């Protein structure tokens, strides 16, 4: 069971007031047998699931999960596993990918707003909002074709637009969580060892080769850049209402149990229930049975 897992998950969120060193501080790999998490995965799946049911029965809440990484973190992977254990009904996963020439002409929160959970829903960002401080941060020339963003020349950038724009993002996030969204932020840490063995592996393979992208070794070559936007921007937007979590992702099953496991004590503090039958209703099904039972 979750004994020393439920004290070892706290230590993930990041605090509002907590400086970051992912380097040192921050495991990417770290208690419980694969074969034991295997199994409580599929119990937190499960719980996950009764959990989204009460939520879109009558939950006055909606429910933000952030997802970012590095490539081959295993992002992909963790987004499928928890969604095939819950209902499409009530659960929408929206992928952000390089902005179109629409939402370019808008503010880099539009498209995030536009994707938004309503009541009783869970909205999945594989990718979000945060890519607008990690990839145009690293990649400061993106900020030119963005026709709302200010920027005409990458040298106009510095700290002051970074800390401007966390204020626009926990602005935003707050209104949200001020009017019923539970938003959850999860960073899946990989070591650039880890990362380096996943893509040799899906270089060598057939049944993954035609997927690889070389171009995800541009990114890694700008991995210091990357660590110290995450760190920046985990230092600056995780609150106590919209925390962050930095989960480590060197061990794809212990990621998702950890995932798991926090996305249900987090949802746990609502204290949710299924409806319950009142007398009147009661009295109503008793009477389709007769009626059913009455049949011809
Ligand atoms: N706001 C943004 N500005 C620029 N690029 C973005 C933005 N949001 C997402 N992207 C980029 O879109 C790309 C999506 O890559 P893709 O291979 O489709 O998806 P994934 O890697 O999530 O499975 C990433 O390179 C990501 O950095």
Redesign the pocket.
Same mark, same amino acid.
Request: no cysteine; net charge neutral; charged share 35%.
């Given at each position: 069971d979750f004994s020393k897992l439920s004290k070892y998950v706290e230590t993930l969120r990041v605090k509002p007031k907590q400086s970051i060193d992912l380097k040192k501080d921050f495991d990417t790999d770290y208690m419980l047998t694969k074969e034991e998490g295997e199994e409580l995965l599929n119990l937190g799946i499960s719980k996950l699931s009764e959990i989204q049911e009460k939520l879109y029965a009558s939950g006055t809440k909606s429910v933000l999960i952030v997802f970012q990484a590095m +490539?081959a973190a295993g $992002? +992909?992977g963790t987004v499928k596993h928890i969604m095939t254990g819950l209902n499409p009904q009530g659960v929408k996963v929206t *992928?952000? $990918? &390089?902005?179109s020439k629409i939402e370019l002409s808008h503010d @880099?929160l539009w498209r995030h707003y536009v994707a938004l959970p309503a009541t009783g829903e869970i909205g999945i960002f =594989?990718?979000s909002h945060y890519? =607008?401080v990690? &990839?145009?941060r690293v990649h400061p020339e @993106?900020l030119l074709s963005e026709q709302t963003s200010g920027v005409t020349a990458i040298e106009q950038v510095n700290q002051k637009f970074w800390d401007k724009r966390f204020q626009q993002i926990n602005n935003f996030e707050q209104h949200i969580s001020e009017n019923g969204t539970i938003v959850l932020k999860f960073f899946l840490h990989v070591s650039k060892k880890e990362q380096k063995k996943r893509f040799i592996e899906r270089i060598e393979l057939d049944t993954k080769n035609w997927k690889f *992208?070389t171009g995800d070794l541009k990114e890694r070559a700008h991995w210091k850049d990357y660590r110290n936007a995450y760190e920046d921007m985990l230092a600056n937007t995780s609150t106590k209402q919209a925390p962050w979590f930095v989960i480590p992702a060197d061990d794809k099953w212990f990621t998702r149990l950890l995932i798991a496991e926090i996305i249900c004590t987090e949802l746990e503090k609502l204290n949710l229930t299924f409806p319950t039958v009142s007398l009147e209703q009661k009295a109503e099904l008793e009477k389709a049975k007769a009626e059913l039972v009455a049949e011809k």
């Open positions: +490539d $992002k +992909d *992928s952000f $990918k &390089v902005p @880099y =594989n990718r890519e =607008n990690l &990839v145009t @993106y *992208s």
